[PDB]
Design a protein around this ligand. Structure first.
Ligand SMILES: CC(=O)N[C@H]1[C@H](O[C@H]2[C@H](O)[C@H]3N=C(C)S[C@H]3O[C@@H]2CO)O[C@H](CO)[C@@H](O[C@@H]2O[C@H](CO)[C@@H](O)[C@H](O)[C@H]2NC(C)=O)[C@@H]1O
Ligand SMILES: CC(=O)N[C@@H]1[C@@H](O)[C@H](O[C@@H]2O[C@H](CO)[C@@H](O)[C@H](O)[C@H]2NC(C)=O)[C@@H](CO)O[C@H]1O
Length: 538
């Protein structure tokens, strides 16, 4: 007779090719990349002959075999490809093979091959669009947004984007390297802990809990190898295999290390760390460099050098040569992008007409033109054009785009920025002709999360009734609201100014639109990005 039918023993059924150590705070110990998951299966035979060979089958295919020597057995073996597999134990002799019922096992890998797709309904005012314009539609999701802002990856309207950027991946370094972090309580210390034992100028993860461990929809079981933003982004990639998910390195507070990269030793180390990061976290499709800014005038008043333009171009060229090696190894297309100042004074510190040859997209940061950081000179923070009362206004979207075009940047590379937030002032006074921007302020407006800044959701929700005036400036293409009794003035993007930007993008053959930051929209802003670029509804 053939052998008795074995019963699979109860035991762990989730294993990982890239393992996350659940009690480690240092990135180097937290993440263990293996060539294959170490899988274990045990079985008992309660009736009959145990056979002479025992096999572990994954979807019918043998992963292990050995002699069947008793009523219970254990197999330890390696599986080098992620997925959910119907595992069976089979006992075989000369008279045939008898297979157990199947038990599903998980062999996790960071492409999310082991995850059910994260396909979540659109929330708030988001309406469905098809990505058929061939234009970029991007937004940034922030790692720390899962706490107070309570905005998680399952809340992203992912069908309505071509690009989803993850803010932000830090670069390791302590004193003198990441001093701008010190302005945020605990932030510099969290980075030193993540980077313990790791060389400076290598990338890391700033908050490994939020990235890998915090329970979230789809990744809530204790034994799920990946949880947090990264586990959900893996599942999101399964739902949206054409969405480009880019890790963004830098931003306002994490840009200091770039200013050292004129040293090719550091720059090589950084580039090699990026390659390793993309080999480790397979759901990412490239890299976004948000260096704020070559030449300085970013967060750190002690950094900035005339050499920065040359460093920027060398960095983009070497990142591209690294991505072309990675693309060759994997067959995938990887993108290289950068978010850049939209101010002509910062733009002309870099030869973008040379760097564009390495890059897929330039994310033009056509926002933060004005704000509570200057109480004396007020203006539209994200306007397309200058306003009628000051046509020589330096900081407008069109001035930034024209600066690039005059360098010789191809229009199709340029992605125009929209704000999902307003900036504002309180106590505005001394203005003429009913134009509050001609006055001066005494402070920042009360903000949603920080002074001087309000989520677009809150503007739409809270500041469109009672005493608040609303005006759409059609020369600048820019809405604002004003409460004259307190002098509260807020400058923002809305559906209409976004429509004007999209129209302009199409008119000038630019690359598309992107936004900061996705948690702050109620749907209005992203809906308008999609519609104005000509994406079809549905
Ligand atoms: C108003 C706002 O959202 N500010 C955040 C600031 O955002 C700027 C970006 O860094 C620039 N890069 C882009 C890409 S778009 C562009 O503009 C936005 C808005 O001006 O980013 C900071 C990080 O660089 C944010 O800091 C975060 O602040 C919260 C507390 O407010 C804190 O909990 C986070 O730890 C801190 N994150 C980091 C990495 O420092 C700021 O919120
Ligand atoms: C036109 C111009 O150069 N405006 C400056 C602002 O850019 C800058 O604010 C900063 O803008 C960045 C995007 O270009 C943001 O990344 C950043 O969060 C923001 N910094 C702050 C503190 O809001 C300010 C610097 O305060 O100066 C303006 O002149």
């Amino acid at each position: 007779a053939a052998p008795g039918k074995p019963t699979i023993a109860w035991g762990n059924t989730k294993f990982a090719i890239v393992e996350v150590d659940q009690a480690a705070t240092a990135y180097n110990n937290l993440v263990k990349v293996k060539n294959a998951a170490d899988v274990s299966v045990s079985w008992n035979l309660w009736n009959g002959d145990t056979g002479t060979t025992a096999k572990i089958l994954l979807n019918g295919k043998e992963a292990w075999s050995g002699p069947s020597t008793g009523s219970s057995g254990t197999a330890n073996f390696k599986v080098n490809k992620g997925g959910r597999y119907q595992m069976q134990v089979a006992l075989c002799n000369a008279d045939g093979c008898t297979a157990s019922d199947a038990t599903e096992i998980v062999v996790a890998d960071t492409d999310g091959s082991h995850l059910a797709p994260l396909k979540e309904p659109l929330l708030e005012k988001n309406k469905p669009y098809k990505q058929n314009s061939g234009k970029v539609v991007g937004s940034y999701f922030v790692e720390w947004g899962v706490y107070g802002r309570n905005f998680t990856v399952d809340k992203i309207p992912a069908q309505n984007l071509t690009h989803l950027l993850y803010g932000f991946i830090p670069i390791c370094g302590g004193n003198g390297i990441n001093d701008s972090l010190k302005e945020i309580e605990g932030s510099f210390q969290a980075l030193q802990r993540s980077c313990q034992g790791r060389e400076d100028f290598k990338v890391s993860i700033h908050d490994p809990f939020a990235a890998l461990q915090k329970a979230q929809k789809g990744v809530t079981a204790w034994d799920d190898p990946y949880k947090g933003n990264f586990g959900q982004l893996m599942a999101l990639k399964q739902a949206h295999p054409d969405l480009k998910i880019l890790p963004s390195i830098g931003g306002w507070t994490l840009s200091d290390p770039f200013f050292f990269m004129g040293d090719k030793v550091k720059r090589d180390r950084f580039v090699g760390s990026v390659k390793e990061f993309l080999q480790t976290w397979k759901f990412f499709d490239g890299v976004d460099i948000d260096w704020e800014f070559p030449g300085g005038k970013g967060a750190n008043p002690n950094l900035g050098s005339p050499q920065d333009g040359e460093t920027y171009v060398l960095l983009m060229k070497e990142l591209r040569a690294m991505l072309d090696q990675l693309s060759a190894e994997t067959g995938r297309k990887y993108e290289l992008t950068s978010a850049i100042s939209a101010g002509k004074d910062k733009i002309d510190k870099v030869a973008y007409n040379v760097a564009q040859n390495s890059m897929d997209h330039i994310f033009l940061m056509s926002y933060d033109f004005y704000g509570a950081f200057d109480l004396k000179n007020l203006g539209h923070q994200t306007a397309l054009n200058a306003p009628a009362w000051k046509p020589d206004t330096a900081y407008t979207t069109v001035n930034g785009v024209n600066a690039l075009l005059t360098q010789g940047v191809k229009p199709g590379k340029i992605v125009v920025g929209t704000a999902m937030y307003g900036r504002g002032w309180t106590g505005v006074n001394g203005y003429q002709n009913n134009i509050p921007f001609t006055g001066t302020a005494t402070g920042p407006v009360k903000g949603t999360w920080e002074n001087g800044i309000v989520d677009y959701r809150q503007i739409a929700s809270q500041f469109m009734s009672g005493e608040w005036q609303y005006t759409y400036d059609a020369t600048a293409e820019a809405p604002y609201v004003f409460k004259p009794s307190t002098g509260d003035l807020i400058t923002f993007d809305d559906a209409r100014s976004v429509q004007a930007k999209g129209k302009y993008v199409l008119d000038k053959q630019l690359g598309g639109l992107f936004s900061w930051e996705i948690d702050a929209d109620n749907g209005d802003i992203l809906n308008s990005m999609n519609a104005s670029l000509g994406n079809s509804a549905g």
